[PDB]
């Protein structure tokens, strides 16, 4: 009979409650105070322009119909009470397929303060859409957005706000750093109004600033392309009469240049414009023909040649000048 007190409270609150109507429908606006706790920022799939994020999407509003007077003040209730009351229909504007986890029970909680304040947090994974400008790849940065707001309620029906200060309203957990390629720098939030045919809606935008780490692409693309150019430029140190020997340097370096040219764009999307890695490849693709037509010049004119005695110095020089000016203009942007 000790739990019959709390049973009579909850059956009284739901008695006459209409869950199809927002609180304060004819009097005021339903202020929904929200904040996000990011448990783990998941991997960013640069091929499909998207990022996975696992959040603790907390929301809080005020309902004056769910006021109670009892032996406690906060009602840490079960999950199925939340479907029997009004909840905001917050959806993500740039989501693509977000899952609400259900193992083992549905991962939601609902707390009802005695004055009518509610808390209602959800555990979600959100596969959002992050439009990126892969021009400076792989030395590029991206502010992947996450925009959420009400769906059926206009800015004269449900306005959103942050619970704490906007600096302290999106918190990223320290252990959750599931990015392997990028690097999370910080987060910034904002609020604004969007325009639609149905009306004006309050949107809530946050931006996650990411910087790509280039340590993968150095040891996969940049170093083997540099070693290919040096492998092409050692052909000037041989003799003129070794015609089958120097054409092996000529053919296989430009054939391993064009395989790396193909295989460096497989992870990229089908981008129409040219990235900064494509500029490094195509210039390095130009030195290996410049070594190849140098050999075709000296084979046509076949003592040591003045062409090989000049290309032994100029070819490592102009490759060094390009390498000095390419890294300076892109690592210091």
């Amino acid at each position: 009979d000790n739990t019959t007190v709390f049973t009579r409270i909850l059956d009284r609150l739901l008695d006459g409650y209409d869950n199809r109507l927002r609180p304060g429908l004819g009097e005021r606006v339903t202020e929904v105070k929200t904040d996000i706790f990011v448990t783990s920022f998941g991997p960013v799939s640069d091929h499909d322009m998207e990022y996975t994020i696992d959040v603790f999407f907390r929301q809080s509003w005020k309902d004056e119909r769910l006021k109670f007077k009892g032996p406690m003040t906060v009602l840490r209730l079960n999950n199925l009470m939340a479907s029997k009351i009004w909840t905001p229909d917050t959806f993500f504007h740039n989501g693509k397929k977000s899952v609400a986890h259900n193992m083992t029970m549905p991962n939601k909680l609902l707390r009802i303060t005695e004055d009518g304040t509610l808390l209602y947090t959800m555990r979600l994974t959100v596969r959002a859409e992050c439009p990126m400008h892969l021009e400076d790849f792989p030395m590029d940065a991206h502010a992947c957005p996450l925009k959420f707001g009400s769906y059926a309620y206009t800015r004269a029906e449900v306005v959103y706000e942050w619970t704490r200060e906007p600096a302290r309203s999106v918190v990223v957990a320290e252990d959750g750093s599931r990015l392997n390629q990028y690097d999370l720098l910080g987060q910034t939030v904002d609020s604004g109004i969007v325009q639609s045919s149905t009306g004006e809606y309050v949107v809530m935008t946050t931006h996650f600033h990411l910087k790509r780490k280039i340590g993968y692409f150095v040891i996969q693309t940049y170093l083997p392309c540099i070693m290919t150019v040096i492998l092409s430029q050692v052909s000037f140190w041989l003799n003129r009469e070794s015609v089958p020997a120097r054409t092996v340097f000529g053919v296989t370096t430009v054939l391993t240049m064009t395989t790396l040219s193909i295989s460096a764009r497989n992870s990229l999307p089908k981008v129409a414009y040219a990235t900064a890695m494509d500029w490094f490849i195509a210039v390095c693709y130009a030195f290996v023909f410049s070594a190849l037509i140098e050999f075709a010049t000296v084979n046509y004119f076949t003592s040591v040649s003045k062409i090989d005695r000049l290309s032994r110095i100029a070819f490592p020089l102009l490759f060094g000048i390009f390498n000095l000016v390419y890294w300076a203009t892109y690592l210091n942007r």
Epitope: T117, E161, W162, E165, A167, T188, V189, S191, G192
Partner: antibody, heavy 117, light 106 residues
């Protein structure tokens, strides 16, 4: 709606002062209380904020250990507490609440402190 | 910490012309930048909550523009009831304020 503060006071340096801001027309438990320092012919200077739902209080870094706020829900009034006040802190103190977009929409009439002889 | 600079300190114009205030933050504040006036020996009030969002009761001549860093307050026609200095605040972090900008009439 209407925000009320008490009248001006004359205090000696090194003493302690008590200043109140009474709110009417709205409860304190849902909106923050913002208190701000307004020196004469000078700009504003925020000193601290109040979350009355849990008693959370965060102060300005300059005024740490200088001001203290208690808030009574029954009296509908928040209180100042200046422990080690000096003669330099001669200004007018304003009362404010959190607005629609974290602004300060409703303001009190302001109480001026005077530390002299 | 956040600092707010209001430029210039003071200016003098007559009734019925254009004035453009300036307020620049140290780092990124999104939209929560508030404009407060201070009539002499009265209490401050609210002009624009957020950026470019007029408060209730103020005239339509007051308008603002919002960005990441710089924020301007614009009055199309200065009237005889605007004898107040204007303070630019921020709310993306713990709130801070500028020095204000006084004005006077001939």
């Amino acid at each position: 709606v209407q925000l009320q503060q008490s009248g001006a006071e004359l205090v000696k340096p090194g003493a302690s002062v008590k200043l109140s801001c009474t709110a009417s027309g709205f409860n304190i438990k849902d909106t923050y209380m913002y208190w701000v320092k307004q020196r004469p012919e000078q700009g504003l200077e925020w000193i601290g904020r109040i979350d009355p739902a849990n008693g959370d209080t965060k102060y300005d870094p300059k005024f740490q250990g200088k001001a203290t706020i208690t808030t009574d829900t029954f009296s509908n009034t928040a209180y100042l507490q200046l422990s080690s006040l000096t003669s330099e802190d001669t200004a007018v103190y304003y009362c404010a609440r959190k607005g629609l977009r974290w602004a300060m929409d409703y303001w009190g009439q302001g109480t001026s402190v005077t530390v002299s002889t | 910490n956040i600092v707010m600079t209001q430029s210039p300190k003071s200016m003098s114009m007559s009734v019925g012309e254009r004035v453009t205030l300036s307020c620049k933050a140290s780092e990124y504040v999104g939209t929560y930048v508030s404009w407060y006036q201070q009539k002499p020996e009265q209490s401050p009030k609210l002009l624009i909550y957020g950026a470019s969002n007029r408060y209730t009761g103020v005239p339509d001549r007051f308008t603002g523009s919002g960005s990441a860093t710089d924020f301007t307050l614009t009055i199309g026609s200065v009237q005889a009831e605007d004898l107040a200095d204007y303070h630019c605040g921020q709310s993306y972090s713990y709130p801070t304020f500028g020095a204000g900008t006084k004005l006077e009439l001939k």
